[PDB]
Amino acid sequence: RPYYIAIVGSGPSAFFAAASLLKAADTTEDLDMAVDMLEMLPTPWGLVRSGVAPDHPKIKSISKQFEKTAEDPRFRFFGNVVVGEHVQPGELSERYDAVIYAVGAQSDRMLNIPGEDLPGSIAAVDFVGWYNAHPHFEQVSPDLSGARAVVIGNGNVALDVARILLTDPDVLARTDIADHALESLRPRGIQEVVIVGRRGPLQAAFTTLELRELADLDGVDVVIDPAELDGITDEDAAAVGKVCKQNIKVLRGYADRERPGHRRMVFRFLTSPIEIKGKRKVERIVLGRNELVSDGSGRVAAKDTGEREELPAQLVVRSVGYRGVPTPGLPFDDQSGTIPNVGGRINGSPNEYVVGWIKRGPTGVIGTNKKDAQDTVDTLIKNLGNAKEGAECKSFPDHADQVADWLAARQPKLVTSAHWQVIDAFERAAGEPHGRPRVKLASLAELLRIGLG
C-alpha cells in the first residue's frame, strides 16, 4: 500500500508539501504516496486566492503549479471540510499515516487600544478578505464614504490596503475584486490614506517593488514629508540590508515631490495609535510620537515620547500582522499564534506536522513556503521509514474509499476537485466578458449552489 497523508489546508505550503511528498515517491523505490487535501473553503489556494491583491493577477499564476499537482491521480481534494468542526485531528491521525497542518494564519493581531472595537475600526485580515470575496468576510462591509482612512503598520499588506482604497475604481473594475467592494469603492469617498508606522523608515517591512509601484496609481499622489527622513541615512540603510537601501532611495524620491486636488497616500513614521474615538463609530484617532532606542536585543524599538495629536478619520485598518488560530486537539503558542514544532513535527505527536505560516509565523512571500514544506516533508518521510522498519506502521485495508465515505458522512456538502472545477469555470466565465479574470462567488451559499449542483 501507499502511505496515506492528509494535508489540512490548500494554500501554498500545502501544495508545496503535496508536491514534495509525490516527488519523494517518484524518486524512491518501495515508497508510494497518496495525498488527501482537506480545505475549509469550497475553493483551494489559500491566500493566493483570498490574500494576493486583485491588482496583482500575475502573482496568482502560481496556481497553475498547484493545478498540475492536483492532476496527479494520487491526489484528492475535499473542500468545505473544516478540521476541528467536521472532523477532528485525533480522527485524522487514526486514518492517515501522517497529517500535515497547513492552515495558515486565519485571524489578526490587535492593537489593544481603547476604541479598537468601534464600527469603522477593522483589521486588514477582514478588509482584505472582504475585498477578495472570502466567504467568511462577506459582511465586513466597511463604510468607505469618509474622506480619511488610517492604516496602521509598515508591511506590504498595509500597502495593499492603501492601494485598494485609492485606486481608480475604473481600474479595479477590470480585476477579480469582489463586486461588493467595487460597489463601495465606486464613489471614491476616501481622499487620503495615512499609513502609520511605529518605528522608522529603516525598520519598515515593506519591500521595494511594492513601494515603487505606488508611483503608477493614476490620480494618487504619494506624500512623504521630508522631515520623515531626517536622521535617516543612506549609510545606516545599507547597514540594514540591500532591500532597505533600495527602499530608502524610493522613499526619498517620493519626498522630493511637493498638490491640491489629488487623492493622497501619506506615510508617517515613528507614530503609534493610542486611542480610537467617536460616538458609535470611528471619528478620530489619537496618535503618539515615538523615538527609536536600543533595547539590548540587537535592534531598535519604539519608545513613546508622550506627545499626543488627534487626527479626524472615518476608517482605521490595522495591518499589524495576521495571526494563527488554535485548532482543537493540537497544541498552540498563544503569544506567537503558531503550533509548536521541531523540524515541522508537532510537539507531542508522532505523526502530525506543520508547514507554512502556522509553523513559522505570518511572514514571507509565497515562495518562502517551498523549502519550509520540503524540510517538514523530509522529517515526516524519515519518521515513516523508521516506523515501517520497526513494524509500527498502521495497518490499513480499499482504505481510500473508506476514508472518503467517512468524510462524506461528516460533511455531505464536501466539494471534490471536479466540483471545484465547476466553481472555477463559473467564476472565470462570469468575468472574462467584462475584462476580468473572474467574478468570485462571495458566500458559502453561492459557492455551494454551483459546486454541489
Ligand X SMILES: NC(=O)C1=CN([C@@H]2O[C@H](COP(=O)(O)OP(=O)(O)OC[C@H]3O[C@@H](n4cnc5c(N)ncnc54)[C@H](OP(=O)(O)O)[C@@H]3O)[C@@H](O)[C@H]2O)C=CC1
CA 21 to chain centre: 24
Q: Does 55 bind ligand FAD (CB under 6 A)?
A: no
Of 111 and 133, the one with the shorter C-beta distance to ligand X is 111
Select from ligand FAD, ligand X, none the partner in contact with residue 46, using the beta carbon and a kind-dependent cut-off of 5 to 8 Å: ligand FAD
Burial class (CB in 10 A: 0-12, 13-18, 19+), 418: exposed
**322 sits near ligand FAD (criterion: CB under 6 A):** yes
Figure out which of the listed residues 363, 371, 409, 434 binds ligand X, where binding follows CB under 6 A.
Answer: 363
157 is in an annotated binding site: yes
* Segment near ligand X (CB under 6 A); pick from 15-23, 155-163, 179-187, 241-249: 155-163
Query: How many CB atoms sit inside 10 A of residue 444's CB?
Result: 16
Part of the chain binding ligand FAD (CB under 6 A), chosen from 5-13, 240-248, 296-304, 435-443? 5-13
Q: Quick check: 356 binds ligand FAD (CB under 6 A)?
A: yes
247 assigned binding-site residue: no
Does an H or E element contain 255, and which?
helix 242-255
Tell me the per-residue interface mask from 271 to 310 with ligand X, x by CB under 6 A, - otherwise. Answer: -x--------------------------------------
Determine the 3-state secondary structure of 333 from DSSP: strand
Positions 209 through 228 that interact with ligand X (CB under 6 A): 210
> In this structure, are residues 249 and 175 in contact, taking their beta carbons and an 8 Å threshold?
no
Strand-pairing partners, residue 290, are 304
Query: Positive or negative CA dihedral for 347, 352, 358, 364?
Result: positive
- For ligand FAD, the binding residues in 159-188 under the rule CB under 6 A are 160
**Does 69 interact with ligand FAD (rule: CB under 6 A)?**
no
Is the CB of residue 102 less than 8 Å from the CB of residue 355?
A: yes
- The count of C-alpha atoms lying within 13 angstroms of the C-alpha of 135, restricted to the half-sphere facing its C-beta, is 15
Using the 8-state DSSP alphabet, how is residue 317 labeled? E
The single residue listed with the C-alpha cell 494618487 is 220
- The SS3 of residue 73 is coil
Catalogue the E-assigned strands of 9-108. 33-39, 75-79, 98-101, 107-108
101 is written with which cell numbers? 497542518
Q: Is 450 annotated among the ligand-binding residues? A: no
Which of ligand X, ligand FAD, none binds 102 (CB below 5-8 Å, type-dependent)?
A: ligand FAD
Q: Residue 425 interacts with ligand X (CB under 6 A)?
A: no
Size of the site for ligand X (CB under 6 A): 25
Q: Toward ligand FAD, which CB reaches closer, 274 or 339?
A: 339
Query: Under rule CB under 6 A, how many of the chain's residues touch ligand FAD?
Result: 35
39, 126, 176, 427: residue in contact with ligand FAD (rule CB under 6 A): 39
How far apart (Å, rounded) are the C-alpha atoms in residues 151 and 276?
A: 12
Contact partner at residue 106 from ligand FAD, ligand X, none, CB < 5 to 8 Å by partner kind? ligand FAD
Q: Which of 3, 131, 254, 322 touches ligand X (CB under 6 A)? A: 322
Q: Compute how many other C-beta atoms are within 10 angstroms of the C-beta atom of residue 175.
A: 21
Residue type at 410 in one-letter notation: R
Interface positions with ligand FAD (CB under 6 A): 8-14, 38-41, 46-47, 51-52, 56, 59, 82-84, 102-104, 106, 128, 157, 160, 322, 327, 356-357, 364-366, 369
Binding site residues, as ranges?
A: 13, 39, 47, 83, 109, 154-157, 198-199, 210, 357, 364-366
